[PDB]
Design a protein around this ligand. Structure first.
Ligand SMILES: *[C@@H](CC(=O)OCC)[C@H](C[C@@H]1CCNC1=O)NC(=O)[C@H](Cc1ccccc1)NC(=O)[C@H](COC(C)(C)C)NC(=O)OCc1ccccc1
Ligand code: NI
Ligand code: NI
Lengths: 302, 306
């Protein structure tokens, strides 16, 4: 029992981290097969980040403009033999295939989904943590200068699913990056110009999963016979900055296991959103919306 | 910027996880050089866990009673060449040295210290998370049956400090294990009997570190000219289930960086313990005491003018 923020073991990803240097700019890259991915802003000189012309910057580079170094484990300098730009990423080709390339896929996560982050500095992994893609397609992480190229991923059935490459900080504790197709989450542009973040929302399905985890951890004071239908809740959600509830097998499994209906959990959300009134749930006095139903299922049974 | 629960990268520890089998019992083990460590309850039959006689169980075993296998990564089937019991652990000597043994040491963490946990099941690493050793020497983790032998560790300056090997669940979301000297954190016995956990306390120094992280993340509404001296605060702490505040360089660095004194943070704790007055600190309405001053410095400290 117990519920904590759990990340996927990072070893298979640590074996793919490299350092990429272009001029005086150094950041992290991901080495899979003969490819090294890194943010394209490595090409910018430090005083020209406001509105870079990436097409003009790309043409000024040759394969020799990029230096790639594996800093952890068997240390090595990898020779860059080709380079192209894919959205907000650089796709470098190196002459050596990564011998520790794991079985992997590239996916783009949807808002409300969770993933693990391997924070890296100077091609060196330094920390692991989990985030949730917010309703406004940002993440609430912990990153400092030199963390770009840090990697977000999930793992299942021996396959690493690479979903994020860190790019920028939008505002205090708010971050964004791109998927490996080079598309920035939230369509933010890789330029240091003010861009508006859309309003965030509480992810209902994740709050429901968390209240089920609370019931499965002996915390059930908030469960009442009171029920609120999905369509009624969804109408209330549109006016109270909560996402629409859409049913899933994972939630049905928790509902069947606890004997508490989804409609009872939706009524509890409406009651708890008005206030906890001096009470806690799993040590918290605010609703937690970053555990998905699958994250909760993982920590209650196999 | 931002502050999250961060664990140390687990790859160096994942390379040391093995599965140990004794009879019909299987659990996780840690392989370092020619040694494999695992919980001694692997020697118990599944229906005799209430009060095992480990001395009697040990004498019935030979080196051949233990099967050690490595499934993940560089696979192996190891041969046990000696065995002994060290507190609540079995120490198995194997004929092959782990070729991926990292630079390491064994340490016992004190209450209020944080560490990373690599949760494992059947010799497979499955999750990573961070915990804090509570004032009552328990941890608030997330573990299910088959997780014993999961490993707690920290990393600093290229060295893995191995500090915990998971053993048991005491009550809902409350866990314990042993350090690698075989001493159970909190002196709990590896038997399935009711055992009283001592009362827990809020770790003051960690709450102070967190309020400094909040100030460094633009949240400073709780900072007032009001001060509480350490001696006065420590007298109040003895009566309100808070630990004694003892000054440290790490806290002084945060106090110097923010220009907010420790005594202002101790006043803020006393005010916030009575209630948050409908406001939040880093999205929370309760005090957070599981980030140490070094954990905060890692995520918030930068360049310093001298
Ligand atoms: C990673 C860069 C790196 O590794 O540099 C070494 C070569 C770094 C990560 C952030 C710094 C602090 N925390 C981070 O997560 N990324 C950057 O610094 C970005 C670099 C860059 C991006 C695009 C073009 C050129 C360079 N820039 C930012 O993150 C920048 C930070 O500014 C502050 C003031 C918010 C900290 N963000 C920015 O300018 O955002 C503009 C914006 C967009 C949307 C909403 C609001 C503002
Ligand atoms: Ni069991
Ligand atoms: Ni066990």
């Amino acid at each position: 029992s117990g519920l904590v923020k759990m990340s996927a073991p990072s070893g298979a990803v640590e074996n793919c981290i490299v350092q990429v240097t272009c001029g005086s700019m150094t950041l992290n890259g991901l080495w899979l097969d003969n490819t090294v991915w890194c943010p394209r802003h490595i090409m910018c000189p430090a005083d020209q980040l406001t509105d870079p012309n990436y097409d003009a910057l790309l043409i000024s580079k040759t394969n020799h403009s990029f230096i790639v170094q594996k800093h952890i484990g068997a240390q090595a300098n990898l020779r860059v033999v080709a380079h192209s730009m894919v959205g907000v990423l650089l796709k470098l080709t190196v002459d050596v295939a990564n011998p520790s390339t794991p079985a992997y896929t590239f996916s783009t996560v949807k808002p409300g989904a969770s993933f693990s982050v391997l924070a890296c500095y100077n091609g060196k992994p330094t920390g692991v943590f989990t985030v949730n893609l917010r309703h406004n397609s940002t993440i609430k992480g912990s990153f400092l200068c030199g963390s770009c190229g840090s990697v977000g991923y999930t793992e299942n059935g021996g396959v690493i699913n690479f979903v994020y490459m860190h790019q920028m900080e939008l505002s205090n504790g708010t971050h964004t990056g791109s998927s490996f197709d080079g598309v920035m989450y939230g369509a933010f542009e890789d330029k240091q110009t003010h861009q508006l973040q859309l309003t965030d929302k509480y992810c209902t399905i994740n709050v429901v999963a968390w209240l089920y985890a609370a019931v499965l951890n002996g915390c059930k004071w908030f469960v009442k016979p009171t029920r609120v239908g999905i369509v009624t809740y969804n109408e209330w959600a549109l006016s109270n900055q909560f996402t629409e509830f859409v049913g899933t097998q994972s939630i049905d499994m928790l509902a069947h296991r606890t004997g508490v209906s989804v409609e009872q959990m939706l009524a509890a959300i409406q009651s708890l959103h008005a206030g906890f009134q001096g009470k806690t749930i799993l040590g918290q006095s605010t609703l937690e919306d970053e555990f998905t139903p699958d994250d909760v299922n993982m920590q209650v049974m196999g």
